[PDB]
Structures are given as C-alpha cells and as structure tokens.
Paper text:
As the virus buds from the cell, the viral protease cleaves Gag into several fragments, including the capsid protein (CA) that then assembles into the mature capsid shell (core), rendering the virus particle infectious. The CA portion of all retroviral Gag proteins folds into two separate domains, the N-terminal domain (CANTD) and C-terminal domain (CACTD). In mature lattices, CANTD interactions form only intra-hexamer and intra-pentamer interfaces, while CACTD interactions are also involved in formation of inter-hexamer and inter-pentamer interfaces. Our results show that, like lentiviruses, RSV is sensitive to IP6 in vitro and in cells, where in the mature CA lattice IP6 binds in a pore formed in the center of the CANTD hexamer.
Residue numbers in the entry:
A (entry chain H), D (entry chain C), I (entry chain J), J (entry chain F): 10 to 148
B (entry chain G), E (entry chain A), F (entry chain D), H (entry chain I): 152 to 229
C (entry chain B), G (entry chain E): 10 to 148, 152 to 229
C-alpha cells in the first residue's frame, strides 16, 4: 500500500532548498533524510517537481535518465541484479524504472504493486546521484 | 509575457532559465508546445555569449534540461 | 541544306552575354547550347560578330585562327583525321576551314555543300576553345576583403570566384580559400573561425560553421 | 540516348534563383519541375553548377555526397534496392552514383548507357534533398 | 570621328579599343585601310603609359588583336 | 606568491604561463599538487577572454601543456 | 659507457635560444648540431629542461610523447623496426622509449646499457620533430603590404618569410608569393610587373626584374 | 675621353652614338676591345629611359649596330 | 678598269645629306644619280662611309647584308640569276657579293676583274634599298 | 662519411654578413674560407639558408640553378668532365647536382655516398659564382 510523504516535511524541505541552496551540506542531509525509505518513481518525481525550480527540474530529469540508463546497462551486464530476475521474463526495462510501463502511468498504487524492492532502491540511488550532479552543476 | 523575456547583461543563466520556464509554463500555450519554445528562446535570447556557446555545441541538444546542463558546464566563470 | 539560327535565340544569347558577361557559367552553358549542332564557318562567324563586341571579336578571330592552325598541324600529323581523306587530294587547307576556299566565300549554301561533317565538328570545337580563351582573357584574389556591411555569403562567393578564375594550380585553390577566409573576413568572423572547437579542413565546412554560428544582424 | 535540358529553361531557373532566392516556394516548385524526369549525374551536376553560386555549390556537393552515402548504407542494408541487383555483382558503388565509375567520367552518353532507372531516381531524390538542406542553410 | 578618339585618363583599355574599332569600322575608310589605322591609333592615342608599353615590345605586333593581347597581358593592374 | 599572480591586461599568455609555472614550482607545495594548481590558476586567472576560451573547450584539458597548446592555437591574434 | 654533453655547449645553446628564439634557422642548426650523436632519453630530457622554459617544456613533453606514440604504432605495424627484434620478446614499449622501463628510471648508465642504437636514433628523431612542432607553435601573409616608404627587397623578405613560415603546403608557396608580388607592392611596382615583356614565372625572376627596372629614388 | 661621354638630357640617340663611336675608335684601345666597350657604354650611359629600353630587350643584342637599330625602332618619339 | 667617283661629287652629296637630311626627295634623287653606273662593293662601301655618319653607317651595313642575303636566297631559288651561271661552279657566294671573296679584299682592281655585271647591278640595287630602309628608320 | 660544418663558424659568418653586408671583401674572404672543402648540396643549401635572408636566398637559388645549367651544358659539350664518366651511364643530370636525384633527397649521408669529387667541386664553384652574382645584385 502506498503512503504519500507529508506535505509538511516537503514544505520544510522546499524552504530549506530555497534559503540554503542546493549544495549546502544541510540540504543534502535533509534530502538523504527524505530519501530514507525506498520511494516509488511517482514519489521522487513529485518531490523534485516541488522542491526544485523549473530549470533545475529539467536538468534533474536529464541526469536521472542518464543514471537509470547506466543502471540498466549494468543490469544487462549482470543477470543477478536485485531488480532483475533469473529468467529473461523479469528483465527490467526503463519504462518500468521511470514509471512509464503498463499499469503504472499516473497510478502510484499500481506502481507500488508491480515494482520490486530492488527496483525501488535502484531508482532511489539513481535519483540521489542525479540530484548531486544537478546541485554541483547549478552553482 | 514569455516572448519579451531577455537575459539581462548582469543576470546569471539559472535565473534567466527559471524566469523563462516559469513564464512559458504559466501561459496559454498547449502542453506539447512548451519545450520547443523554451529551447528556441534559450537560443535566441540569452545574450550572444551564451548564444554562441549553444550554437557551437558539438552534440545536438534536444531538451531544456540538456541545454541548461551544457551551458552550466561550459559557461564563462565570472 | 543550310538553315540559319533563330535571331530570337541569338538576341537572347546576346543579352545574356551583355548582362552576365563572357565568363559566367550560365553564359558558357548557353554557348554550348547554341553550339550543339555542327555549325558552318558562316554561322559561327556571324554569331560571334553579333554576340561579341568589336575588340572581343578581334581577339576571338585571332584565337580561332590559332586553334584552327593547331588542328591543321594535327591533321598533317595524322592522315586519318575525320576532316581529311585517305588520298592526298582530300587534305584540308585553312582556306576550307575558315570558309575562304573557292566556292565558299560569302555563300553559306555552297559552304554546306562542300564541307565534311568532320570539318564542321572540328571548326565548332576550335571556335568553342577560342571563345573560352577570349573569355578568360577579356576579364585579384589577394586584394579581396569582406566589407564592413557585406554579408558572409557574398564575400565567400566573390572570393571563390576570384580564386577559381585565376592563375593558381587546381591543387592550390582550397588551401588559399581557407587561409583567405581566416585572414580576411573582418575580425568578428576571424575570431569565430579561430575559436572553432573542431578543425575545419574545407571551404564548405567553414562556410557551414560560420553560417550556423554567425551574429544575426 | 541522352538529351540535355534546354538552356532557356536553365536560364529562366537561374534568374528565378537570382531574384527570389533559394528558399522561396516558387523556387522549390521550379526546381521540382526541372527535377521531373530522372536526371543523370552529369545533368544535375551541371544544373547546380549553373544555378548556384560557388559557395552554395560547394555546400551542395557536400550535402549530395552525404545523402548519397546514406542511400548506399540503406542499399547495403537491403539487397532489394531498385538500384541494386539480386547477385553481389550488381551492388552499386558511390563511384557509379556520383558518375565517377569507369566509362562514365565526363561522358553523359556512356553514363546514360550503364545507369539503372532506380539509380537515376535515387540520385535525383538525393540531389533534391541536398538542395533543400543547402537552401535551409544558406539563409 | 575616329581621329578624335583618345583614351581617357580613367578609362580602361578594352573600352578604348572597343570604341576605336567601332568608330574606325563604321566609317568611310576602305576595308583594306582599317587595320593599319587601328594599329597606328593604338600607338599614338592610348595615354603615354600604354604608348610606352607598346613601344617597348620585344616582338613586332602586326595586328590589332595581337596588340590588344599584349597590352592586356602586361598592363599595370590598377 | 603564486596565488597573487594575474595576467595583466597587456601581457601575452606565454609570459603569464612562464611566470605562473615558475612561481608554482619554486614554492612550498608538494610535487603532486603543482599540476592541478597550475591548471586551476590558468582557469581563474588569465583575464576573462582566455577564461572563456578555456571554459568552452570541446575537449577536456587535463595538463598545463595541453591547455597552453590549445590557448596558443585559438588565441585572439592582436 | 655514457658521456654527458658539455655544460659549456649547453649554456651557449641556451643563450642562443634566449636571444634568437626557438624558430630562427641558426637555432635549429645549433639544435641539429647538438642532436648529432644518438642521445639517451636522459640526455634529451635534461637538454630540453635546460634550454626551454617551463611552458615550452610542457608543450615539448606532450609533442614528444605523441611522436613516440606514432613511432610505436609504426613499429607494431612492421616487425622489422631497427628498434624492434625478430621475436615478440624484443618488442619495444613506450616505457623503454621514454626511459620509464625497469632498470632505466633515473639511471643513465643502465639506460645506455639496455637501449638499442635503433631505439636511440628513433628517440632522437622523435625529439627533433617535437622540437620543430613546439617551435612552430610557441611563436599573416595575406595582410602584408609594401609601405609607401619601404624598399622592395625589404618587402620581398618580409613576404617570403611570412609565406614560408605559414600553414600552406610546400607546393603552394611560389604561386602565392608571385600573386602577392603582383597585387601588393604599391601600384608603381604593380605596373612595372604588369608591363613585363617577358613572362615571369618565379619569385627570383620577378625580384631580379624589379631590381633592374626600379625607379631609383 | 670615351669614358666621360654621357647622353645629354636633350640630345638625340644617333648623335650620342656617333660621338661615342668616334671617341672609342679614335682612342688607345686595341681593335678587339672596341665593340664590347661601345656596347657596355651604350648600356650604362644613354640616360635611364634608353637604359631600360636596352635592358628589357627580349632578344640578346651582341653588336653596336643591332643595339642602334633596336633603339631606333622602339624609341620614344618626342 | 676601275675608275673612282669624283671626290667633288662625293663632297657635294655629303653636304646635301648634311643639310637636307637622309629622307628628302632631293637627297634620294642625288643618290639615284650617283647610283647610275653599276658600282663595285668597294665604291658603294666607301661612298656610304663618307656620306653617312657612324651610326647610320652601321645601320646601313646591317640592312645591306640583309638585302644581299635575300638576293642570295632568290639566287639559290633560281639558277638563271644574272649573277649566277648555268653550272654549279658559278654560284655566287656572299663573300663575292660583299667583296670578301679571294682576290677581292681591299683591291678594287681585282674586284672589277672577277665580278659580273649582273653581280654589280644586284649589289647596287641592294645598296639602294638598304639606303632607303635606313633613311626611313633614322628619322 | 659526412661531417657538418660547425654552427659556431656558421653563426660567426652569419653575423659577418649581417654587419658588413654581402659585398664586402672580408665577407667574400670568409665565404671563400667556409667554401674550402668541397661541400655537398645539402651543406651549401643549408649554409645559404642560414646566412642569407629570404629574398637573397630566393635570388641565390635562381642564380645557382642557372650556373649549374651552364655547367651541365658544358658537360654535355665535353664527355671528359670530372663530374661525367666515359660511358653514357655516368652522365650527370641536374637532379644529381641539385641533390634531387634518387637516394639523395633530404639524406646527406646517401648524398656523400653517390656523389663524385668532381661533382662536389663543380657544385661548389657554381654556388660561389651564384653568391657573387647575388651579392652584386642585392646592393
């Protein structure tokens, strides 16, 4: 069952990003805090939509896609990925990682249903690395 | 008005990009026409130093995020 | 039977030579067009009398004579010329080529009667080469600068024209055009070419790059 | 048997390009008109030599070469090209497309002899696309 | 009138030759007297730079076309 | 002092590079810290024309010699 | 046995490079002189460390590495390199060329022991070519005009210098020098060259003609 | 004295040649040294207009008579 | 037997050439008068030495040689020259025309002995034409 | 075996030419000194490249070529040239004199191998005469 993040925590994090900036160690610590439980693509996408401005959000979408593509290359380079399965029918496509696959587009409940925990942690680590890249790039 | 937005002589590029994306997304354009307009406004606004920086891009930039990343990488630190 | 060329085509060709000049590729194409069927000496002579001015016509008469003399030297160097015959009685004299022989002076009908098709095609090729020589002679790359108000495509057109229509070898035109793009073409475009992250090794590539990144104004 | 294009039509087209420019819809319509019958490499080459200036002609040679190379890549990607044949002995090299092959250099009659109709239409479409590219690039 | 034709201080040589040949051939002279007159008018008209250029001709020029070719070759580019 | 070296408005780039490399190598830095410092001083000193010239480098320059070669190639002749 | 180069010769060469520069023909001749016997990587490295400044030395290290890499590519493209051997165990790695291999780092005696004469001559030629590249890089013909008061031999010297010390191919220098003599070289000499009864087809012939018939003033 | 003979600014060339040949043949030179001396005096005397006229001779003149004929042909009528 | 021309007539002709010039019709008439009887090479040579200055004399020697060479070409082109004979042993060399042959150098008596009347008239006409050329050239 | 000239002597000679000029008797004496041993085309070419400026060097190349051509004309006029041999296979071409022949272009060692001593002394005398001509011409 999907539970959304508190809008109070999200508002506090957005104001933190607004006053301290993207690169302060306190901001990265707060992001790591709100990045503790494995989030669904819907959660991370809406979170970055709210806390980041338009241009940093575009940059972050780009960087997240690139990092997810590196993850999928490593996944096709190793059939023992915690997102993959043993047979070929469990291979994870980027539509399933970005939340674009069938039964997931716009629906967080179905998303949480079909996604694997390894998928969730890989998406989360990818999003964190992308946030770091964009923060280092913006300023 | 989005079509009247220029990057000031002293303004940074992230502020200009924020202002432009805000004015373009909060306007009367269809949703499928915002990205091309944002790109073509990055190319024609954004005073001629960044204009030439985007023009001489060995890669083809097909997204506002990619253009922003490229410009932030290769911008003239000043 | 001799049929004259249309005065309408001749008038259009004369106006083409008058506006475009003698050396433009469109003018040479038009001349090649009106030089399609083998012409009698009368036809080519009157054609050059009409389309060319007096001084270019004198130059062209000279050049045509020289080229016909080279042809007659090659003809006496080979008895199998399409203008010649097998016996010595068919050897072709310059009076027969220039239309000065007996039964031909001023009469195009008799001309067409006695002349050979090989004679006609040799005369025609000679006249074409003479026209090319005179055109190259009648009308400096290192003095070409891009004006303060001139666009870049006009400057490139002028420079490539003057470099290709000059005395340089064919293998020295591209490097000269490149190095003239780099040193002429006023300092804004000079710096635009200098700061090229890629290496431009062809005039076309330089033109494309400059047209992409030029300062719209 | 090869028949040349009328120098009257070519002169009119050259003056059209001179007054209206390269990109006007009337100019493109006129080019499409003079691009109706499949032309031999000699014809298109001389046509572009006459109607285009020196620098646009260089650009057009470049673009025509690139488009012909794309065509030859598609041809080696499909043995059923109307320019190709069934056996390997009919594979079409760029020397045959640009008119540089043996028995074709400078001779339009031999050109028309050895060339295929599929070869002619491919060359013609390539030249038209190259003209469009150069026209979009010049202004 | 052919005998009144001079090469102007700023006029090129091909224009002067065209004008002179026109006026000489469209005149009352016999046909066998046009070439010598054209030559001797090239030599005495055609302001003293070209006069000296024709005078110091190592070869003997015996035709208006040859004189025109020689002068066009060795003329002072300006 | 290496951290006080600036490229003068009229100074050429090879003189500035000579002075900077001299002051950096004849200082108290460890040997393994001279190249990164020389690079980052080329990037932040070396007045904004050369700063932007180094910034917009399509290739990544990872050595003082490579930076010097690139700048000498693409420098504004004046 | 390794013998070092004289510090007196090295000091004289360093002062030559300091006063004349890197590109003067006397400097290149002196470098060729001190590049006569095949040098060990230690010798050439210390020589360039002493005679070149810091930034030219960095550039020279880069260029030397690139040229040595081209040499090693040619060596793997031909097993008959005078640095290589017949078997695969004599293949020469860049650590052995740059003096970085085992038993060579910092020791010139061991260097001279293990190195081949072909290795030495290849290293030496590579270093010479790298020096030439850096000299051409460390320090415009189409902008050269003959000043109103300048003599013609000075203008010819300046023009030939700038044309031969440029990026043109070797087969394009003479035509460019001629056509620059004709279009530059203020209109008195322009007309003097134009009205040449003979055809001048060489810069030396043009210079001789102009020096003969020039207006003494 | 032959070595002091110059062509005056207003003197014609045949008078100068007469005077020079007279003074050279009526002097103390050997008979086999008169022609080369007369030629080399035509070339170095005979004020610079005729000097340049003789210098730019497409043919090689190897006799005083040939030089005189050439100069009389191509001289500047004045 | 050789008889020299009167030095009185030669002095009068020299003064005529001195006052009237080389090209006046009276001077040419006087030269034609003193060119009435066929002269030996010695006579014409001394006459031109006396009446002409040094430079016109050099020019006249050149022109006389050229005209005599044309005469000898016409003579080898026709064996019926009044200077020639029927057999090959009477062919006239330029040494015999210019007075340089054996038995003639410096001796006018021997000259008059060996020379033919056709030789004399040819030499005389050649000298007259050469005088005309030099007179037209000098002024 | 080829030995190069000392760059010290060449530097001193270059400075002599720079201060005294090309025509001073001391400069010609110094050139005669450095022209004592028979030099290979490489040596003389590099020497004139170093001591002479660009325009005098062009003039000197011209004059050297002309003098070498006169030498080769005299050589074809006499089969007993110290550069020639007795048979026709030893005839010396200008490519061998200017150092342009096969096995000589750019290589002084091979040059010294194939060249004759008569060839060397002829090249040297030709270069000296050319230097004299250019020195008399420059000033």
């Amino acid at each position: 069952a999907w539970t959304p993040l508190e809008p109070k925590l999200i508002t506090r994090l957005a104001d933190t990003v607004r006053t301290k900036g993207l690169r302060s160690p306190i901001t990265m610590a707060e992001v790591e805090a709100l990045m503790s439980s494995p989030l669904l693509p819907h959660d991370v996408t809406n979170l970055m939509r709210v806390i980041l401005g338009p241009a940093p959000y575009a940059l972050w979408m780009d960087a997240w896609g690139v990092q997810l593509q590196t993850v999928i290359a490593a996944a096709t380079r190793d059939p023992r990925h915690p997102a993959n399965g043993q047979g070929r029918g469990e291979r994870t496509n980027l539509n399933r990682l970005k939340g674009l696959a069938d039964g997931m587009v716009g629906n967080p409940q179905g998303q949480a249903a079909l996604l694997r925990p390894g998928e969730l942690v890989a998406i989360t680590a990818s999003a964190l690395q992308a946030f770091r890249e964009v923060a280092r790039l913006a300023e």
